[PDB]
Design a protein around this ligand. Structure first.
Ligand SMILES: O=C1NC(c2ccc3ccccc3c2)=N[C@@]12O[C@H](CO)[C@@H](O)[C@H](O)[C@H]2O
Ligand SMILES: O=C1NC(c2ccc3ccccc3c2)=N[C@@]12O[C@H](CO)[C@@H](O)[C@H](O)[C@H]2O
Ligand SMILES: O=C1NC(c2ccc3ccccc3c2)=N[C@@]12O[C@H](CO)[C@@H](O)[C@H](O)[C@H]2O
Ligand SMILES: O=C1NC(c2ccc3ccccc3c2)=N[C@@]12O[C@H](CO)[C@@H](O)[C@H](O)[C@H]2O
Ligand SMILES: *Cc1c(COP(=O)(O)O)cnc(C)c1O
Ligand SMILES: *Cc1c(COP(=O)(O)O)cnc(C)c1O
Lengths: 810, 810
C-alpha cells in the first residue's frame, strides 16, 4: 500500500506464504480448518522471527571477531510493548507480510492486535530503556540490555464502579515467540551467608544459591541488518535445594519468587527485601556474563576500554560494590586498582527528583542479605569521605551530607551517593533537571567532581513512535522529503518550508482526522462509548501521580462544565477530554483521583444540556499498545506537572512528533521542546521553577486561591457537598483536604493561568488552518527528541564509542 | 546397519540432514562452531518430531470423521522414559537418522544419551500405562491417555556414603520438544465451596477455581501411521486470583502446587490433601474434555457406546461421582439413568494387594474439599447397600464389610468399594491376583456381581523392550523368522524349532555377551567400577520394598561370601550381583536395605580372597533408561516377592524377553511365565500362596529358622555384631529386629529353598550350551506377555471395540 512500509516483491510474498503454512502445520500443529486468529498470529510471528535469525547470529559473530567496546545497559525495567510490527518495520517486511497475509485471506492488522504487550515496566523509565535499545541497534553499537524476565509485568487495570482493580498480567500464558531460552548459560547467584577474613583476604561463605537462567530477545536495528540482544534473567532453584520430600520441592518457589513480579510503583521507593533481591540478582548474574565475555578476547587495565556499564537509576547500583567484590576478592586485584577500573567502567543516569523515589536501603537488610557488599560499601564511604575532608578541610557538615551512610533511628545507604562516587559520569535526563542536580540535591558532589556531571536529554524512537503507530503521517512526510528522516530525524526541519503549502496543510489535517475517526471507532468496538470525532481531543496519558496533576486537569474539566451550565446557549469549542493511566496499587490518593475522574464523567457525560460539547473519558489499561493508538489521535497534549518535578517526560515528545499541540509547564523536556519549536508555537502556562521556590519561602497557602477565585471555590464546594458523589456525599473529602491543607504540588497556584491558557487553545482550534500550521511547526522541530540523538551523545560523551549508520551484510 | 531399523534411502537421508541444519539455525539459533552435543540432540529431536506432525493431525481428523468409540485411560502416572529412539523405531527412521547424523560427523547413540527420562511415575503401574499407550496406538484404537504434567517427576537418587539422597528431577529445565502446549483448551476446576439445595436441584457454589491447561504429547503406533494423544494437565491460577498486590501474585503458587510434584510412594497410600487435589484435578479436567468431544458428534443414552473410561487403580476413582455430578446437577438427568450411564462407561483395574496401598480417604477431607462429591458418594452407598440387603437379607455383617463408608475414630471412604459399585468391569493384572481378588479382598462383591470380575494379565511393549533396547537380539530373531513378530509377539514360538540349531545357539549367546561387554563399559565410563564380564549377571531391579525381598537376595549374597571364606580355594561360578531401585523418601526400612546392600558391597568387593568371584553393585538412579541398558545385559532375573504380594510384576517379563533365566516365587505373572515356558525352564522356589496361609494360621516364628539353619544364624550374628558396619556396630539392628520379630514377608521361610535353587542356577551356568538352550525356550514362549495381547483383551472384553493392524495412509 504505502512506500515507507517497503517492497512486496513477488518472490518475497510467495516465500512468506509458504513459510506461514509450514509453521501453521509443523510449529503450531493445526490445519486451516481449526485455526483461530491467535494461531494465525503465532504463525506470522514465527515466520517473521525466522528473518531475524541469520542477522542475530552474524551480528553476535561480528562482535566476537571485531571485539569492539561493549555497552551494558542495566535496568530493572524494559517496557517493550509488542514486537511483531516493530520487527517488520525494522526488516522492511511490513508490506510483504501485509500482501502475504492478504492472499491467505487474513487481515494482518487484526493479527497484530492479538499480541500481548511485554509490559516489564511502569512507564517512562522502562520505556526509555526500550527506545534506547532500538537506537543502540540502529546506530550499530555493540549493546546489550540486561534485566529480569518477570513472569508478571505491570498489572492489567480494570475499572469497576469507577475504581481501579488490578489483575495479574499473565503475558507468558500463550508463550513468547520472541524469546530464546539459554538454560546452558545458567549462572549462580549468592545471598545471605557471612564473611570470613583469612590471610588470602575476605571470603563470602555459607550462601544460599539461586540460579539465573537467561532468556535472549533480539533487538533489530532499523534496516541495517544489526540485531543486538536483550538478555533477561529468570530465577531457578538448584536441584539439591532444601534437599519432608514434598515440602522441600514446593519450597523451591521461595527462590523463584525473585523473578516472579514487577514492582508496580512509579517514582516511589518501597524498601522491601524481595526488591533488593531482584536488584542483586540482575547485577550478580549480568556481571558474571560481562566478565566471561571480556576474558574471551588475567589483566583488567583494559576492562574499561572493552566495557561500559550504564546504570538505569540506582536500581542496579549494587553493580559497583559487586564489581569491586569480584576484582578484589575473586581476581585478587588491590583495592585502588580495582576501584579505578570500576569508576572508569560505570556511569549513572539519574531519573529522579522526588525524595520519596530515592533508594535508601536500611543497613540491617544489606547486613543480612549481602554482608560482604556492606563491608565494601563502608570501605567506599571511608575512602570517599577522606577525599572530601582533604578538599574541604573543617567542613564537617559536608561530610555528614555526602556520606553514603545516612544516620538515623535506622541507618540507610544512599544508593545515589554510591553511584556518584563509583561512576565516571552522572547525567540527568533533561537540561533543567541536570541543572537542578548540580544546584540542589548533588551540589556538594558537583563541587567536588564537576567533570562527572552531564546532561543527556531524553528522546523516543521515531520507528515505534512515528512509522509504526502513525503510518499515514510518516507517508505524507516521506512524500515531500524522502525516507531518510526515519534514522535521521533532524531532517524534519525541511518541513518548515511546507508551512504555507496548502496541499501539505490539507494532508496533515486529513491524517489527524483519519487517526481520530479510527480511534473513536476503536472506543466503540472494544469499550461501547460514543465520541464526537469533530471535537478537540484533549488527552493526558501517563501514570497517575500527584506531581503530574491530573487533578489540575480535572479542575479545568469541571470549570468548562460549570461555564456551560451558567450559559448553556453559548458556543464553546467541543472537547473530548481523555485521561488515562494506572495508579500504583498502594497509592490511595492516585486511586481516589481515578475515581474522581470517572465521577466527573458520570455527571458530565449524562447531562442533556451539555450535548456532545464536553465528554470525559477515563482510558482503561493505559500501556504501550494503547499509547500507539491514542497519541496519533490527539490534538492537545497535557504536560502539566508542577515545575521542577518531571525530570524529563517522554510522552510529551511522542505527542509533538504525532501532530498534537502541547499545553504545558516549563518542566522537564517541555523547556527544550518550546525552545526548539518557538514559544509562540507552544501553550506555556504557570509557575517556573523560580516561582515555586519563592512560593515555598513565603509558604503555600491554598486558602488564598480559594478566597480570591470564585470559579475555584464553586468547584471545591461541589466536591465537598457530593455534587459528584450523590450516594457518598463525603467520598472526595481526602482530595479536598489535601488540596486545601497538604498540596505539595501547588495545584491551585497554577489554576488561573491554566484555565486562561486553555481558552487560547480553544480559540486557535476554531481556526483549523492556523492550528495546523502550528502543528507543522511542532512536527518539523521535533528532530532533537529522537533517541538516536540521545544515544549518539551517550556514546560520544560517556561510553567512548563512535556510532555508525553503515549496514552489516544481509 | 541392521534390517529391523528400516531403510536409509538416499533422498530420505539428504532430507533429514538438511532439516537437521535448518532446525540448528532457525530453531536453536546456533551455528555449528558453537553447538554442543545437547544442541545436536535438540536439532535431531525437532527433525524427528516433524515426521509425527502430519500423522498426528490426520489421525485426530480420522477419529472426528469416523467417530469411533473413544478410550480414556486415566492414570496419575505415565512412566514414559525417553521419546527420541521410540519415535524413530515406530516411524522406521532409525537407520536413516543414524546415516544422516553419521554424515554430519555425529554419533546418534551419544545424542540419545542426552535426552532426559520423562519420569512421571514410580515404577510398574506408571510403566504399564506407558506400554498400554504404545499398544493402543499400534492396535489402532482411538485412545487417549490423561494425567498430570508434573513439573518434577520421580526424584533422582544419589548414593552418598552408601545412603540414598534425593534430588529434584528438573526434567523440563532444557525444554520438552515432545509436548505441545494447548493453552487455548484450558478448563476450570473447582475446589472447596459448599452445596446449596434449590427447587432446580443441588448447586455447588463459592468454589475456588484452578485452571487446567493441557499439554499434548504424541503417541505413535508401530509403523501404522497412527498417532494417538497423551494429554497432561498443568495447574494455573486464574488472573483475578487472590485479587497487598505483591503477595497476592506470589500466592498464585498455592494453586499451581497441584501439578508441581509426583508423590514418590510405590504401593503405599499417603492420605494428604495435596494428593487428593491432584486426583480431582485430573478427573475434573479430563471429564469436561470427554464430554465436550462427545457432544461434537442432549442425549446421554449413547454416551457408553461412544466413551470407555478406564481407571488405573483408584487414583482417579472420583471420575465416578464426578460423572454423576455432571449428569445429575449440570445435565439434569435423573439419578437412575445417570448411574446406568456411569456404570456402563467406567471400568476399574486393581493393581493392589497390600492393605496399606488401598486408598481410604478420611471423610473430613472430602467434606471440606469436595462437598457435593461426598453427598453423591453417600447416595451411592445407600442405593448400593439397599441392593446388598435385598440379595443377602439379614446379613448385617456383609453390609458393614461392603459399605463404601468405613466406621472408626475417623470415618473413611473406601475408594476400591466405590470403583466396584460404579464400574461394569473390575480386573486384576495376573491370573493368580485376579483369583485372590475373588477369594479374599472382594469376595463379597464377587458374590453380588460375579459378572464384573475379569483377569487381564499384564504385558510390556516389545518395541521399547526388545527392538529398542536390544537391537542385536531383535536382528538374529528377524534373520530366522522375519520382522512381523514385533507387532505379533506370539510368532516367537517359531524359535522353538531353532533350539538345537548350533548357529542360533551361538548367536543368542554372542548377543548376550555383547550386551554384557557394553553394560560393563557403561559402568566404568559413568561410575568408575570394574566388573568381570564373564561372570553371571545376577540382577534385581525394581523399587525397594520389603515385599519384593531385596533382603532375601542380600542373605543369598552374604551366604556366598561366607562359603568362599570357609573354603577359599574351591571353585564357584563367579557372579556380579547387581541390585538397584529407589526407596520412597519416608520409608525408613527401604532406606536401611539400600544401606545394607552398599555395606555388603564394601566388605565383599574389597576382600582379596574373594577375587573377581563375587561382586555386589548397587545400581544408582534406577529408571526406564537404565532398565533399557541393564535388562539386555542380565543372565538371571530375580523375581522373589513373597507369594501373594506382587500383583503381577512387569520387570519379570522384560527379562524373559531379553534372554535371562528367572529365579522366582510362584507370585504374580511369574506363574503364567513358568506355565508358558515350562516349569523345567524356570527356577521356581519357595512357598506357594497356600503355604503362606498355612504358616499364618499356625504363626510365623522366625526364631525356628534361626535355630535350625546354622548358615542363617551366622549371617544374623554378623549383621548384629557389626561385621558389615565396623564404625557403627548397631547400624542394622532395625533390620535384624524386623527379620526376627516383625517380618510380614517371611524372608527366613524361603531362605533354604532359595539358596538351594541358586545352586541349581550356578550349575546350569557351568554348561553354556544348555544355559542358552533354556534361554531360547524362554524367549520363544514370551509372546503372551506382549502388551498387545493385553490391550486386545481389554478392547474385546471390557471396552467393546475391535483392535486393528491396518495402516492409516502416510
Ligand atoms: O518515568 C520515570 N520513572 C522514573 C522513576 C524514578 C524512580 C523510580 C524508583 C523506583 C521505581 C520506579 C522509578 C521510576 N523516573 C522517570 O524517568 C523518565 C525517564 O528518564 C523521565 O522521563 C520521567 O520524568 C521520570 O519520572
Ligand atoms: O521455544 C522456542 N523458541 C525458539 C526460538 C527460535 C528462534 C527465535 C528467533 C528469534 C527470537 C526468538 C526465537 C525463539 N526455539 C524454541 O526453543 C525451544 C527450546 O530449545 C524448543 O523446545 C522449541 O520447540 C523451539 O521453538
Ligand atoms: O508397580 C505397581 N505399583 C502399584 C501401585 C499400587 C498402589 C499404589 C498406590 C499409590 C501410589 C502408587 C501405587 C502403586 N501396583 C503395581 O502395579 C503393577 C502394574 O499392574 C504391577 O505389576 C505390580 O505388581 C504392582 O505392585
Ligand atoms: O515450543 C513449541 N513446541 C512446539 C511443537 C511443535 C510440533 C510438535 C510435534 C510433536 C510433539 C511436540 C511438538 C511441539 N511448537 C512450539 O510451540 C510454542 C508455543 O506455540 C512456540 O513458542 C515454539 O516456538 C514452538 O516450537
Ligand atoms: C512514553 C510512555 C510513558 C511516559 O510518559 P510520560 O507522559 O513522560 O509520563 C508512560 N507510559 C507509557 C505506556 C508510555 O508509552
Ligand atoms: C518395568 C519397570 C518397573 C516394574 O518392575 P517390577 O520388577 O515389576 O517391580 C519398575 N521400574 C522401572 C524403571 C521399569 O522399567
Amino acid at each position: 500500500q504505502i512506500s515507507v512500509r517497503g517492497l512486496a516483491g513477488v518472490e518475497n510474498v510467495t516465500e512468506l506464504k509458504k513459510n506461514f503454512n509450514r509453521h501453521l502445520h509443523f510449529t503450531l500443529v493445526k490445519d486451516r480448518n481449526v485455526a483461530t486468529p491467535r494461531d494465525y498470529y503465532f504463525a506470522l510471528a514465527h515466520t517473521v522471527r525466522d528473518h531475524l535469525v541469520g542477522r542475530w547470529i552474524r551480528t553476535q559473530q561480528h562482535y566476537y571477531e571485531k571485539d569492539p567496546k561493549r555497552i551494558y545497559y542495566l535496568s530493572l525495567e524494559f517496557y517493550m510493548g509488542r514486537t511483531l510490527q516493530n520487527t517488520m518495520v525494522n526488516l522492511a517486511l511490513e508490506n510483504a507480510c501485509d500482501e502475504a497475509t492478504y492472499q491467505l485471506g487474513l487481515d494482518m492488522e487484526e493479527l497484530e492486535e492479538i499480541e500481548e504487550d511485554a509490559g516489564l515496566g511502569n512507564g517512562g523509565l522502562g520505556r526509555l530503556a526500550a527506545c534506547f535499545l532500538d537506537s543502540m541497534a540502529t546506530l550499530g553499537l555493540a549493546a546489550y540490555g540486561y534485566g529480569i524476565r518477570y513472569e508478571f509485568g505491570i498489572f492489567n487495570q480494570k475499572i469497576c464502579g469507577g475504581w481501579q482493580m488490578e489483575e495479574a498480567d499473565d503475558w507468558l500464558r500463550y508463550g513468547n515467540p520472541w524469546e530464546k531460552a539459554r538454560p546452558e548459560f545458567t549462572l549462580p547467584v549468592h545471598f545471605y551467608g557471612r564473611v570470613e577474613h583469612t590471610s588470602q583476604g575476605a571470603k563470602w561463605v555459607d550462601t544460599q544459591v539461586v540460579l539465573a537462567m537467561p532468556y535472549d530477545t533480539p533487538v533489530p536495528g532499523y534496516r541495517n541488518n544489526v540485531v543486538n540482544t536483550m538478555r533477561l534473567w529468570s530465577a531457578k532453584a538448584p536441584n539439591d535445594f532444601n534437599l519432608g520430600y514434598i515440602q522441600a520441592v514446593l519450597d523451591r518457589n521461595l527462590a523463584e519468587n525473585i523473578s516472579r513480579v514487577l514492582y508496580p510503583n512509579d517514582n516511589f521507593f518501597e524498601g522491601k527485601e524481595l526488591r533488593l533481591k531482584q536488584e542483586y540478582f540482575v547485577v550478580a548474574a549480568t556481571l558474571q556474563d560481562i566478565i566471561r565475555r571480556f576474558k574471551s578476547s588475567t589483566n583488567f587495565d583494559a576492562f574499561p576500554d572493552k566495557v561500559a556499564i550504564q546504570l538505569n537509576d540506582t536500581h542496579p547500583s549494587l553493580a559497583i560494590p559487586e564489581l569491586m567484590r569480584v576484582l578484589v576478592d575473586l581476581e585478587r586485584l588491590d583495592w585502588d586498582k580495582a576501584w579505578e577500573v570500576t569508576v572508569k567502567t560505570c556511569a549513572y543516569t539519574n531519573h529522579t527528583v522526588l525524595p520519596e523515589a530515592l533508594e535508601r536501603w536500611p543497613v540491617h537488610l544489606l547486613e543480612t542479605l549481602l554482608p560482604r557488599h556492606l563491608q565494601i560499601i563502608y570501605e567506599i564511604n571511608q575512602r570517599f569521605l577522606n577525599r572530601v575532608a582533604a578538599a574541604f578541610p573543617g567542613d564537617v557538615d559536608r561530610l555528614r551530607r555526602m556520606s553514603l551512610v545516612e544516620e538515623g533511628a535506622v541507618k540507610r545507604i544512599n544508593m545515589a551517593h554510591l553511584c556518584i562516587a563509583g561512576s565516571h559520569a552522572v547525567n540527568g535526563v533533561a537540561r533543567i533537571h541536570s541543572e537542578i542536580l548540580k544546584k540542589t540535591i548533588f551540589k556538594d558532589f558537583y563541587e567536588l567532581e564537576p567533570h562527572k556531571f552531564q546532561n543527556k536529554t531524553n528522546g523516543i524512537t521515531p520507528r515505534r513512535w512515528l512509522v509504526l503507530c502513525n503510518p499515514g503521517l510518516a507517508e505524507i512526510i516521506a512524500e515531500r522529503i524522502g525516507e531518510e528522516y526515519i534514522s535521521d530525524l533532524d531532517q524534519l526541519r525541511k518541513l518548515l518550508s511546507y508551512v504555507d503549502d496548502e496541499a501539505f496543510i490539507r494532508d496533515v489535517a486529513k491524517v489527524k482526522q483519519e487517526n481520530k475517526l479510527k480511534f473513536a471507532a476503536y472506543l466503540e468496538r472494544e469499550y461501547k462509548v460514543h465520541i464526537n470525532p469533530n471535537s478537540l481531543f484533549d488527552v493526558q496519558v501517563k501514570r497517575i501521580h500527584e506531581y503530574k496533576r491530573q487533578l489540575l486537569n480535572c479542575l479545568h474539566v469541571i470549570t468548562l462544565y460549570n461555564r456551560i451550565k451558567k450559559e448553556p446557549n453559548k458556543f464553546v469549542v467541543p472537547r473530548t477530554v481523555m485521561i488515562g493511566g494506572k495508579a500504583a496499587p498502594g497509592y490511595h490518593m492516585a486511586k481516589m483521583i481515578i475515581k474522581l475522574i470517572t465521577a466527573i464523567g458520570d455527571v458530565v457525560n449524562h447531562d442533556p444540556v451539555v450535548g456532545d460539547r464536553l465528554r470525559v473519558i477515563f482510558l482503561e489499561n493505559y500501556r504501550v499498545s494503547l499509547a500507539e493508538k491514542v497519541i496519533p489521535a490527539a490534538d492537545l497534549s497535557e504536560q502539566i506537572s508542577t515545575a521542577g518535578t518531571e525530570a524529563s517526560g517522554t510522552g510529551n515528545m511522542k505527542f509533538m512528533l504525532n501532530g498534537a499541540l502541547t499545553i504545558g509547564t516549563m518542566d522537564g523536556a517541555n523547556v527544550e521542546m518550546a525552545e526548539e519549536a518557538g514559544e509562540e508555537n507552544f501553550f506555556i502556562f504557570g509557575m517556573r521553577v523560580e516561582d515555586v521556590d519563592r512560593l515555598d519561602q513565603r509558604g503555600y497557602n491554598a486558602q488564598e486561591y480559594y478566597d480570591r477565585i470564585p470559579e475555584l471555590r464553586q468547584i471545591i464546594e461541589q466536591l465537598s457537598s457530593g455534587f459528584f458523589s450523590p450516594k457518598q456525599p463525603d467520598l472526595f473529602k481526602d482530595i479536598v483536604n489535601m488540596l486545601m491543607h497538604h498540596d505539595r504540588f501547588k495545584v491551585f497556584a497554577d489554576y488561573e493561568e491554566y484555565v486562561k491558557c486553555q481558552e487560547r487553545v480553544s480559540a486557535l482550534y476554531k481556526n483549523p488552518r492556523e492550528w495546523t500550521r502550528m502543528v507543522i511547526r511542532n512536527i518539523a522541530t521535533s528532530g532533537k527528541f529522537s533517541s538516536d540523538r540521545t544515544i549518539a551523545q551517550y556514546a560520544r560523551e560517556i561510553w567512548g564509542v563512535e556510532p555508525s549508520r553503515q549496514r552489516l551484510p544481509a
